[PDB]
């Protein structure tokens, strides 16, 4: 009985840390591409009972419904932590057993990745770090086990929240969880695994 929660911005103010290397339109294109991939991946997962997108944008909300998500309104520019917290409280009020927070910028995410994080015991915090190992690209818990600390040194914050509460932690590290696209270096790493995949799978 896992609810998946994908927080998503307005497309006109998405991936601001790529504004040096992509145009306004190139950032919208990458934002939508990655988000319907994340949403579509969770939607096809036999492990995801329900799928909620949190967004302030009619544009984002229509794309998300079309990909099969239910929609929760959030105000703009509150950050991932408060958008996920809003959803967690709605899901908790509504009887939700477990919730998995997944950002919309994981272009390599697969069924294998969802399955592994969903195999954390119900009474633990499941936690998937980013490539530099300071951030959090997935967390699954009982609604209300810890408060949320997404963005910045989030991995540290989550681990410390679990320690304080004496709650077990299951860390899941993989190529597919770790690469979120925020920075130019991140986009190039994405581009580079997509060329590897032409060669390995095709030629
Ligand atoms: N509804 C709502 N959605 C938002 C908002 N702010 C951003 N998001 C979404 O939260 C997700 C991650 O934003 P991003 O800039 O990639 O965060 P990042 O630095 O990688 O760190 C987050 C997490 O991965 C971590 O490492 O702790 C994306 O799907 C954003 O669109 C917002 O105020 N409202
Ligand atoms: Cl974004
Ligand atoms: Mg990110
Ligand atoms: Mg990140």
Residue numbers in the entry: 12 to 214
What did the published study say regarding this structure?
Coenzyme F420 is a microbial redox cofactor that mediates diverse physiological functions and is increasingly used for biocatalytic applications. 3PG-F420 is formed via activation of 3-phospho-d-glycerate (3-PG) by CofC, but the structural basis of substrate binding, its evolution, as well as the role of CofD in substrate selection remained elusive. Instead, enzyme assays revealed that 3-phospho-d-glycerate (3-PG) is activated by CofC, presumably forming the short-lived intermediate 3-(guanosine-5′-diphospho)-d-glycerate (GPPG), which is further transferred to the FO core by the action of CofD. Here, we present a crystal structure of the 3-PG-activating CofC from Mycetohabitans sp. B3 and define amino acids governing substrate specificity.
From diffraction data collected to 2.4 Å the crystal structure could be solved by molecular replacement with a model of two superimposed structures (Mtb- FbiD and Methanosarcina mazei CofC, Mmaz-CofC). Intriguingly, after initial refinement both molecules in the asymmetric unit independently showed unambiguous difference density for GPPG, the reaction product of GTP with 3-PG, completely immersed into the active site pocket. The 3-PG moiety is primarily bound by H-bonds with the side chain of S165 to the carboxy group, apparently a highly conserved binding site of the carboxylate of the C3-acid as known from Mtb-FbiD. The reason why the 3-PG adopts a new orientation is the main-chain rotation of S162, the CA and CB of which then squeeze the 3-PG into the productive conformation.
